[PDB]
Design a protein around this ligand. Structure first.
Ligand SMILES: Cc1ncc(COP(=O)(O)O)c(/C=N/[C@H](C(=O)O)C(C)(C)S)c1O
Ligand SMILES: Cc1ncc(COP(=O)(O)O)c(/C=N/[C@H](C(=O)O)C(C)(C)S)c1O
Lengths: 392, 392
């Protein structure tokens, strides 16, 4: 895998910011898109037929995560919408008082609140697997937290703050043994490593196109055919209908049952081209590149005095940290001045922020186009920043 | 208003199809976008901050439809999502057995089925204002159909099939007199004429950005502040939260209560530029251009033997028709061969198709960049088509 060849593909990396080269370290929020993807979306904003392309893209998505059937690949507005859908069509119809839903402390808001509302409405109860010191889950902890009263476990595959890769294959086993389905938020895993939903045996899996070189506006919700068959739709209109009566309507078959309103043609075809691209590079190749960057970043961050890093040693390609004494918003500002783009904030993980005893953090995240030289620029600029602020 | 100057702004109109000039008559499905809008969206797919722009766009939308407050302008995924939201947060919480919801026979599926589900779930009843012969509603009919049991009236401002402009200001009065709110689907009105939600006194109003020179992926739901204040959110996650507890969360204030997940920054800023554009042309100017085209089209269509046109004389800028004997899909195919783009199908109006006793129709729709010369090309090609098929 050749980083020059790859970088040539992202016109945005040639952008100057304030006389410096863009150093783009916010992929966890949005990847950039290569020329192949860009050209594809340009094509679908001139004149067309289209649905060869649309269903073709569903097929590429299905093969990509190794789903058994296209009936199991639904296009949605985003991973937030995906998770809300499972909470409304699956959770609200399968929970009764006494039933438990268990999640983790590391979750995105969209993987917390929909379960909260589903539990309030059904009068069931919500439960949290506790975290280890280093921000990991242990299989012991899940084993203990899941009762044979647990109907749903929901978990991030990769944490967007800690970079922890959760043992989701094993958690699936533990959920099944207790009579539960597992719901996996794969927003942060799918861009960076092979996903095989059969081997993971997750019951639902959600991915975000804009994190994986595709357009925004488009997510995919995977669910097992059999679960999807019994779920009622969350949204109504457009093209999810078979017969519309005056009082009564019938739904289409899967997957179209779940796609109300106006098909996101360009977005899906775009996601498909993004998939074509990543596959031609190899996800394994990508993942090895990210392990190097992450080991490198964590080592060089240990050289810096009074910066805290959060999470485990083994990690996806991101590190969340704080400068002693300095506000993360301020760090982000100064790095911006130098053309270095990191994100500051709570990362829609308020619970987890409280758990780390912090109100905010900065985050640098890495993808297939980042390099060690960029990590050096980050470390040098963090140094320059610690000095610059101990001096006011 | 100068049509050459306007047409110069849409690069897509210079596109050749099969050695002919594009004749684009499917604006009711998607408008095209001018250079100003295109450049704007290009800008937000290079490197950025952003939220000056986002909230700025909400303000431009508010001034555009003359809402009292930004608290009343919610960004959504589309008019389908908008209508589903009102059905779930408003309808399902305000209907009891005995309550009526009344709609029309001309509605889009997304303005039928969500009310069907809301009524099934609350055990209330759904009712239909009957149509006149010419596809119009009469105020008598609404007066008769609304009882002081009616809690919600829902109506298309402009029909996507018939081109009928519904008397929504008056219907608002009739709904209020009976103790009901009105919900208006303005997908087909907003691109073509001034909207003033204070004068119309609608309780909710929904518009689609991609019909009005803006990007797709973005709708606006207007609701009266006071109604919105009591509605509970439909979706949970992202940035609609104030405090996230372990069991219990608080929402942000309006409008952010209603925007779960990841803000559609580029889309909103794009819609704002589309608004800037239309406003610099003048919506009145646009609307007068469309009346000429529509009168012209209906007159030239009357010259054609054995084509049926549907709807009234007074109309928005669209005509839906059928060739005697010829399948609309086939018409669309032949016109495509000549570079003329019309849409064929049921237009997500299955009930209305059944009412007109047809399984499908063809539709030509007009916007600020269309001309009489294009209508001539359509009429000539429809003639060429009637001959071509009486001959097989
Ligand atoms: C784990 C996880 N799940 C869901 C989302 C939301 O994805 P989407 O915007 O497609 O709704 C995200 C998006 N994360 C952004 C980020 O971490 O940069 C966010 C903080 C905007 S949520 C996420 O990390
Ligand atoms: C009256 C009306 N209401 C809602 C919609 C759907 O708008 P949106 O795609 O933003 O969800 C539409 C979209 N109409 C297309 C059309 O008529 O071309 C459609 C048939 C795809 S729904 C519409 O006409």
């Amino acid at each position: 895998m050749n980083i020059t060849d790859i970088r040539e593909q992202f016109p945005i990396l040639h952008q100057q910011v304030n006389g410096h080269d863009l150093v783009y370290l916010d992929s966890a929020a949005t990847s950039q898109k290569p020329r192949a993807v860009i050209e594809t979306l340009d094509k679908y904003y001139n004149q067309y037929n289209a649905t060869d392309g649309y269903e073709g893209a569903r097929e590429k998505v299905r093969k990509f995560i190794n789903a058994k059937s296209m009936a199991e690949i639904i296009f949605t507005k985003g991973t937030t919408t995906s998770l809300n859908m499972v909470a409304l069509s699956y959770a609200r119809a399968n929970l009764k008082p006494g039933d438990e839903v268990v999640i983790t402390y590391m979750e995105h808001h969209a993987n917390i609140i929909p379960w909260q509302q589903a539990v309030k409405a059904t009068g069931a109860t919500l439960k949290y697997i506790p975290l280890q010191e280093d921000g990991t889950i242990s299989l012991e902890d899940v084993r203990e937290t899941v009762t044979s009263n647990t109907k749903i476990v929901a978990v991030s595959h990769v944490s967007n703050v800690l970079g922890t890769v959760n043992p989701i294959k094993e958690m699936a086993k533990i959920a099944h043994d207790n009579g539960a389905v597992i719901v996996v938020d794969g927003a942060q895993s799918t861009p960076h490593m092979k996903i095989d939903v059969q081997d993971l045996d997750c019951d639902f899996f959600a991915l975000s196109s804009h994190k994986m070189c595709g357009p925004t506006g488009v997510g995919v919700l995977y669910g097992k055919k059999a679960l999807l068959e019994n779920m009622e739709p969350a949204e109504f209109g457009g093209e999810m209908i078979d017969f519309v009566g005056l009082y009564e309507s019938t739904w289409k078959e899967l997957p179209w049952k779940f796609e109300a309103g106006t098909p996101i043609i360009a977005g899906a075809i775009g996601l498909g081209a993004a998939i074509d691209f990543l596959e031609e590079i190899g996800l394994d190749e990508i993942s090895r590149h990210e392990h190097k960057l992450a080991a490198y970043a964590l080592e060089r961050f240990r050289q810096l005095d009074g910066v805290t890093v959060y999470g485990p040693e083994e990690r996806a390609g991101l590190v969340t940290f704080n400068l002693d004494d300095v506000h993360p918003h301020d760090v982000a500002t100064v790095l911006d001045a130098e053309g270095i783009a990191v994100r500051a904030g709570h990362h829609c993980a308020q619970p987890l922020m409280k758990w780390l005893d912090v109100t905010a953090t900065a985050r640098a995240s890495f993808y297939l186009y980042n390099t060690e030289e960029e990590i050096d620029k980050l470390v040098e600029a963090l140094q320059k920043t610690k000095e610059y602020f101990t001096n006011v």
